[PDB]
PDB file of C-alpha atoms in Angstrom:
ATOM      1  CA  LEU U   1      59.453  -8.448  24.917  1.00 12.79           C
ATOM      2  CA  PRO U   2      55.867 -10.298  22.883  1.00 13.63           C
ATOM      3  CA  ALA U   3      55.249  -6.384  20.180  1.00 13.37           C
ATOM      4  CA  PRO U   4      52.351  -3.833  20.254  1.00 12.65           C
ATOM      5  CA  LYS U   5      49.854  -5.457  18.258  1.00 13.69           C
ATOM      6  CA  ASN U   6      46.981  -4.777  15.831  1.00 14.00           C
ATOM      7  CA  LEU U   7      47.426  -1.099  14.570  1.00 11.42           C
ATOM      8  CA  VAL U   8      45.053   1.213  13.400  1.00 11.22           C
ATOM      9  CA  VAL U   9      43.694   4.831  12.294  1.00 11.19           C
ATOM     10  CA  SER U  10      40.709   6.902  13.228  1.00 11.70           C
ATOM     11  CA  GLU U  11      39.646  10.071  12.815  1.00 12.93           C
ATOM     12  CA  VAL U  12      41.066  11.069   9.658  1.00 12.34           C
ATOM     13  CA  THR U  13      41.716  14.622   8.695  1.00 16.32           C
ATOM     14  CA  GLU U  14      43.544  16.948   6.945  1.00 17.69           C
ATOM     15  CA  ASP U  15      46.019  17.381   9.676  1.00 19.13           C
ATOM     16  CA  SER U  16      45.632  15.060  11.787  1.00 17.82           C
ATOM     17  CA  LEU U  17      45.178  10.603  12.776  1.00 17.23           C
ATOM     18  CA  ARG U  18      44.183   8.909  16.249  1.00 20.17           C
ATOM     19  CA  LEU U  19      46.527   5.777  16.190  1.00 20.13           C
ATOM     20  CA  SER U  20      45.067   2.943  18.179  1.00 15.77           C
ATOM     21  CA  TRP U  21      46.614  -0.529  18.920  1.00 12.43           C
ATOM     22  CA  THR U  22      46.745  -3.382  21.955  1.00 12.30           C
ATOM     23  CA  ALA U  23      49.543  -4.585  23.584  1.00 11.74           C
ATOM     24  CA  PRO U  24      49.548  -6.487  26.664  1.00 12.42           C
ATOM     25  CA  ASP U  25      48.518  -5.216  29.926  1.00 13.22           C
ATOM     26  CA  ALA U  26      50.974  -3.272  31.802  1.00 12.69           C
ATOM     27  CA  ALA U  27      53.949  -5.156  30.071  1.00  6.62           C
ATOM     28  CA  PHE U  28      55.879  -1.902  27.996  1.00  5.42           C
ATOM     29  CA  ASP U  29      56.602   1.157  30.338  1.00  5.57           C
ATOM     30  CA  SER U  30      56.853   3.189  27.397  1.00  4.36           C
ATOM     31  CA  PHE U  31      55.643   3.276  23.597  1.00  3.16           C
ATOM     32  CA  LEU U  32      58.097   5.112  21.435  1.00  3.17           C
ATOM     33  CA  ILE U  33      55.954   6.164  18.364  1.00  2.00           C
ATOM     34  CA  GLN U  34      57.436   7.115  14.824  1.00  2.00           C
ATOM     35  CA  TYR U  35      56.487   8.952  12.130  1.00  2.00           C
ATOM     36  CA  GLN U  36      57.583  10.328   8.613  1.00  2.60           C
ATOM     37  CA  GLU U  37      55.941  11.751   5.270  1.00  2.00           C
ATOM     38  CA  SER U  38      56.775   8.448   3.081  1.00  2.00           C
ATOM     39  CA  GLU U  39      57.956  10.424   0.126  1.00  2.31           C
ATOM     40  CA  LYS U  40      59.979  12.781   2.049  1.00  4.96           C
ATOM     41  CA  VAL U  41      63.844  12.094   2.071  1.00  3.21           C
ATOM     42  CA  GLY U  42      64.530  12.590   6.116  1.00  5.05           C
ATOM     43  CA  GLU U  43      64.314  10.840   9.113  1.00  6.76           C
ATOM     44  CA  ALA U  44      61.390  10.570  11.337  1.00 10.78           C
ATOM     45  CA  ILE U  45      59.394  11.812  14.348  1.00 13.13           C
ATOM     46  CA  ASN U  46      60.227   9.985  17.392  1.00 16.10           C
ATOM     47  CA  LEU U  47      57.535  10.343  20.390  1.00 14.41           C
ATOM     48  CA  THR U  48      56.885   8.671  23.618  1.00 17.74           C
ATOM     49  CA  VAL U  49      53.925   8.123  25.227  1.00 16.42           C
ATOM     50  CA  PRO U  50      53.369   5.962  29.078  1.00 15.25           C
ATOM     51  CA  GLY U  51      52.991   2.425  28.486  1.00 14.27           C
ATOM     52  CA  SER U  52      49.501   2.780  29.738  1.00 15.37           C
ATOM     53  CA  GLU U  53      47.993   4.264  26.946  1.00 18.19           C
ATOM     54  CA  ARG U  54      46.628   2.458  23.813  1.00 20.80           C
ATOM     55  CA  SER U  55      45.625   5.322  21.363  1.00 20.30           C
ATOM     56  CA  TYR U  56      47.348   9.142  20.150  1.00 21.69           C
ATOM     57  CA  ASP U  57      46.122  11.454  18.044  1.00 19.62           C
ATOM     58  CA  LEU U  58      48.603  12.592  15.952  1.00 17.02           C
ATOM     59  CA  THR U  59      48.819  16.584  14.716  1.00 16.69           C
ATOM     60  CA  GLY U  60      50.542  19.031  12.848  1.00 12.54           C
ATOM     61  CA  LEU U  61      49.980  16.993   9.585  1.00 11.15           C
ATOM     62  CA  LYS U  62      49.583  17.496   6.116  1.00  9.83           C
ATOM     63  CA  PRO U  63      46.647  17.400   3.626  1.00  7.53           C
ATOM     64  CA  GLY U  64      46.466  14.442   1.292  1.00  4.02           C
ATOM     65  CA  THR U  65      49.739  12.967   2.578  1.00  2.00           C
ATOM     66  CA  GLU U  66      50.862   9.376   3.320  1.00  2.00           C
ATOM     67  CA  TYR U  67      52.622   8.601   6.464  1.00  2.00           C
ATOM     68  CA  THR U  68      54.271   5.724   7.749  1.00  2.00           C
ATOM     69  CA  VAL U  69      54.199   5.168  11.428  1.00  2.00           C
ATOM     70  CA  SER U  70      55.391   2.447  13.488  1.00  2.00           C
ATOM     71  CA  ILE U  71      55.391   1.868  17.243  1.00  2.00           C
ATOM     72  CA  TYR U  72      57.540   0.070  18.915  1.00  2.00           C
ATOM     73  CA  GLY U  73      56.786  -1.702  22.988  1.00  2.00           C
ATOM     74  CA  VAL U  74      59.705  -0.599  25.328  1.00  2.00           C
ATOM     75  CA  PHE U  75      60.987  -1.801  28.315  1.00  2.00           C
ATOM     76  CA  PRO U  76      63.378  -0.900  30.529  1.00  2.00           C
ATOM     77  CA  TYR U  77      65.882  -3.033  33.434  1.00  2.00           C
ATOM     78  CA  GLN U  78      69.095  -2.188  33.977  1.00  2.00           C
ATOM     79  CA  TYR U  79      70.272   0.767  35.531  1.00  2.00           C
ATOM     80  CA  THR U  80      73.313  -0.162  37.873  1.00  2.00           C
ATOM     81  CA  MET U  81      75.795   2.251  39.727  1.00  2.00           C
ATOM     82  CA  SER U  82      79.019   1.884  41.059  1.00  2.00           C
ATOM     83  CA  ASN U  83      80.272   1.494  44.177  1.00  2.00           C
ATOM     84  CA  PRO U  84      79.711   4.782  46.986  1.00  2.00           C
ATOM     85  CA  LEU U  85      82.681   6.661  47.486  1.00  2.00           C
ATOM     86  CA  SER U  86      82.331   8.181  50.789  1.00  2.00           C
ATOM     87  CA  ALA U  87      83.826  11.036  52.546  1.00  2.00           C
ATOM     88  CA  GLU U  88      82.829  13.741  55.158  1.00  2.00           C
ATOM     89  CA  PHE U  89      83.618  16.977  54.734  1.00  2.00           C
ATOM     90  CA  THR U  90      83.377  20.537  56.998  1.00  2.00           C
ATOM     91  CA  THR U  91      82.563  23.834  56.085  1.00  2.00           C
ATOM     92  CA  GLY U  92      83.796  26.233  58.059  1.00  2.00           C
ATOM     93  CA  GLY U  93      83.025  28.441  60.559  1.00  2.00           C
TER      94      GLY U  93
ATOM     95  CA  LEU J   1      81.372  -0.140  35.666  1.00  2.00           C
ATOM     96  CA  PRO J   2      84.409   0.719  36.652  1.00  2.00           C
ATOM     97  CA  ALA J   3      85.108   3.314  39.820  1.00  2.00           C
ATOM     98  CA  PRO J   4      84.936   6.991  40.563  1.00  2.00           C
ATOM     99  CA  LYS J   5      88.101   7.483  42.619  1.00  2.00           C
ATOM    100  CA  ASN J   6      90.077   9.969  44.880  1.00  2.00           C
ATOM    101  CA  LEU J   7      86.950  12.155  46.473  1.00  2.00           C
ATOM    102  CA  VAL J   8      88.412  15.776  48.084  1.00  2.00           C
ATOM    103  CA  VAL J   9      87.092  18.961  48.602  1.00  2.00           C
ATOM    104  CA  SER J  10      88.528  22.392  47.840  1.00  2.00           C
ATOM    105  CA  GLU J  11      87.155  26.118  48.178  1.00  2.00           C
ATOM    106  CA  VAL J  12      85.676  25.436  51.619  1.00  2.00           C
ATOM    107  CA  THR J  13      83.215  28.677  52.376  1.00  2.00           C
ATOM    108  CA  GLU J  14      81.149  28.965  55.489  1.00  2.00           C
ATOM    109  CA  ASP J  15      78.210  27.736  53.487  1.00  2.00           C
ATOM    110  CA  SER J  16      79.424  26.000  50.154  1.00  2.00           C
ATOM    111  CA  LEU J  17      81.656  22.942  48.841  1.00  2.00           C
ATOM    112  CA  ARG J  18      83.721  22.639  45.917  1.00  2.00           C
ATOM    113  CA  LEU J  19      83.201  18.604  45.590  1.00  2.00           C
ATOM    114  CA  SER J  20      86.063  16.780  42.550  1.00  2.00           C
ATOM    115  CA  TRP J  21      86.614  12.968  41.617  1.00  2.00           C
ATOM    116  CA  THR J  22      88.865  11.221  39.430  1.00  2.00           C
ATOM    117  CA  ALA J  23      86.588   9.001  37.164  1.00  2.00           C
ATOM    118  CA  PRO J  24      87.445   6.988  33.699  1.00  2.00           C
ATOM    119  CA  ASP J  25      86.395   8.837  30.324  1.00  2.00           C
ATOM    120  CA  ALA J  26      83.560   7.482  28.337  1.00  2.00           C
ATOM    121  CA  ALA J  27      81.745   4.815  30.987  1.00  2.00           C
ATOM    122  CA  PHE J  28      78.810   6.987  32.612  1.00  2.47           C
ATOM    123  CA  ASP J  29      76.081   9.236  31.748  1.00  3.03           C
ATOM    124  CA  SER J  30      75.543  10.658  35.670  1.00  2.70           C
ATOM    125  CA  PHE J  31      77.135  10.720  38.890  1.00  4.49           C
ATOM    126  CA  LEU J  32      74.429  10.560  42.243  1.00  3.72           C
ATOM    127  CA  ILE J  33      75.910  12.951  44.780  1.00  2.00           C
ATOM    128  CA  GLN J  34      74.130  12.213  48.237  1.00  2.00           C
ATOM    129  CA  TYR J  35      75.071  14.437  51.531  1.00  2.00           C
ATOM    130  CA  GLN J  36      73.280  15.242  54.369  1.00  2.00           C
ATOM    131  CA  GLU J  37      74.079  16.303  57.752  1.00  3.00           C
ATOM    132  CA  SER J  38      76.184  13.913  59.713  1.00  2.81           C
ATOM    133  CA  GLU J  39      74.278  14.538  62.692  1.00  6.15           C
ATOM    134  CA  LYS J  40      71.263  15.689  62.201  1.00  6.19           C
ATOM    135  CA  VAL J  41      68.990  12.869  61.626  1.00  5.68           C
ATOM    136  CA  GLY J  42      66.831  13.546  58.487  1.00  3.62           C
ATOM    137  CA  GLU J  43      66.410  13.023  54.446  1.00  7.32           C
ATOM    138  CA  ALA J  44      69.960  13.674  52.391  1.00  7.72           C
ATOM    139  CA  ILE J  45      69.523  14.740  49.048  1.00  4.91           C
ATOM    140  CA  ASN J  46      70.177  13.976  46.179  1.00  2.00           C
ATOM    141  CA  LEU J  47      71.460  15.404  42.724  1.00  2.00           C
ATOM    142  CA  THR J  48      72.354  13.879  39.124  1.00  2.00           C
ATOM    143  CA  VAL J  49      75.206  15.912  37.439  1.00  2.00           C
ATOM    144  CA  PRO J  50      76.631  15.153  33.561  1.00  2.00           C
ATOM    145  CA  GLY J  51      78.788  12.380  33.628  1.00  2.00           C
ATOM    146  CA  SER J  52      81.324  14.228  31.757  1.00  2.00           C
ATOM    147  CA  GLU J  53      81.590  16.126  34.900  1.00  2.91           C
ATOM    148  CA  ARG J  54      84.842  15.952  37.681  1.00  2.43           C
ATOM    149  CA  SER J  55      83.476  18.878  39.479  1.00  2.00           C
ATOM    150  CA  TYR J  56      80.576  20.010  41.501  1.00  2.00           C
ATOM    151  CA  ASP J  57      79.544  22.682  44.725  1.00  2.00           C
ATOM    152  CA  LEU J  58      77.062  21.729  47.387  1.00  2.00           C
ATOM    153  CA  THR J  59      75.699  25.437  48.528  1.00  2.00           C
ATOM    154  CA  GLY J  60      72.776  26.059  50.966  1.00  2.00           C
ATOM    155  CA  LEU J  61      74.974  24.846  53.768  1.00  2.00           C
ATOM    156  CA  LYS J  62      75.343  25.582  57.438  1.00  4.20           C
ATOM    157  CA  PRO J  63      78.261  26.684  59.013  1.00  2.96           C
ATOM    158  CA  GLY J  64      81.314  24.326  61.190  1.00  2.32           C
ATOM    159  CA  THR J  65      79.356  21.525  60.046  1.00  2.60           C
ATOM    160  CA  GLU J  66      79.978  18.276  58.555  1.00  3.22           C
ATOM    161  CA  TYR J  67      78.696  16.178  55.931  1.00  2.00           C
ATOM    162  CA  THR J  68      78.574  12.996  54.709  1.00  2.00           C
ATOM    163  CA  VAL J  69      79.670  12.598  51.156  1.00  2.00           C
ATOM    164  CA  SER J  70      78.780   9.497  48.546  1.00  2.00           C
ATOM    165  CA  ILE J  71      78.879   9.583  44.480  1.00  2.00           C
ATOM    166  CA  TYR J  72      78.159   6.774  42.595  1.00  2.00           C
ATOM    167  CA  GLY J  73      79.055   6.628  38.884  1.00  2.00           C
ATOM    168  CA  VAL J  74      76.015   6.250  36.981  1.00  2.00           C
ATOM    169  CA  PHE J  75      74.492   4.261  34.133  1.00  2.00           C
ATOM    170  CA  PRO J  76      70.990   4.221  32.844  1.00  2.00           C
ATOM    171  CA  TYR J  77      72.146   2.103  30.073  1.00  2.00           C
ATOM    172  CA  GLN J  78      70.228  -0.958  28.945  1.00  2.00           C
ATOM    173  CA  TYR J  79      66.387  -0.645  27.102  1.00  2.00           C
ATOM    174  CA  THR J  80      64.815  -3.404  25.541  1.00  2.00           C
ATOM    175  CA  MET J  81      62.088  -2.551  22.866  1.00  2.00           C
ATOM    176  CA  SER J  82      59.776  -4.825  20.774  1.00  2.00           C
ATOM    177  CA  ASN J  83      59.983  -5.080  16.919  1.00  2.00           C
ATOM    178  CA  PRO J  84      58.499  -2.231  15.077  1.00  2.00           C
ATOM    179  CA  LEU J  85      54.211  -2.118  14.402  1.00  2.00           C
ATOM    180  CA  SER J  86      54.507  -0.970  11.408  1.00  2.00           C
ATOM    181  CA  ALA J  87      51.808   0.769   9.077  1.00  2.00           C
ATOM    182  CA  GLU J  88      50.936   3.653   5.718  1.00  2.00           C
ATOM    183  CA  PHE J  89      48.110   5.637   7.314  1.00  2.00           C
ATOM    184  CA  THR J  90      47.090   8.746   4.808  1.00  2.00           C
ATOM    185  CA  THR J  91      45.521  12.231   5.780  1.00  2.00           C
ATOM    186  CA  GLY J  92      42.943  13.896   3.712  1.00  2.00           C
ATOM    187  CA  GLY J  93      42.301  16.504   1.341  1.00  2.00           C
ATOM    188  CA  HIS J  94      43.341  17.474  -1.909  1.00  2.00           C
TER     189      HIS J  94
END
């Protein structure tokens, strides 16, 4: 999986940021977005947007605050099942 | 994946069946359960039940009716992601 590219930002308000990026066409099924305050001792907020988008608007933010933001490209493959276990069952009446 | 084993049923009513099975611990994320009427042509219904569960009750069934019942152990396993694209962006006004 080659990565997403060139993450940029627009619409900088006190409480919101619009993320824009570039990914290869129809490559990723999903986009994982992580963000947290840079100064906050804690763990990130995880978001998920379909592999079709190229922009997203972070909301609920704090004024004048710096946020470390990372975006991953995701692509599933294997879901695997077992061999079926079959039976014929008959109700009552 | 290893397998679910020994499908049996208990508590049979005129409209319900309690399924039960054995499976090794911590292998499956879920179990897929298919059921349909044996004769009458049409679609089967698929349910997922959590992978810690070793029994289930089918409901909304018909009297004196036979059901083809199948159960698969499942894992929605392997994701792969790219290396993160990180950046530091800052809000306005302070």
